[PDB]
Amino acid sequence: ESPEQRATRLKRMSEYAAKRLSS
Numbered sequence: 001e002s003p004e005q006r007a008t009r010l011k012r013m014s015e016y017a018a019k020r021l022s023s
Contacts, residue, residue, distance in 0.1 A: 003010070017023070
């Protein structure tokens with residue numbers, strides 16, 4: 001129980017990914 005550190009990494013792909021259902 002510590003996703004706080006794994007947060008940034010969990011969403012370290014792009015600040016604003018292209019809108020899409022699958023992409």
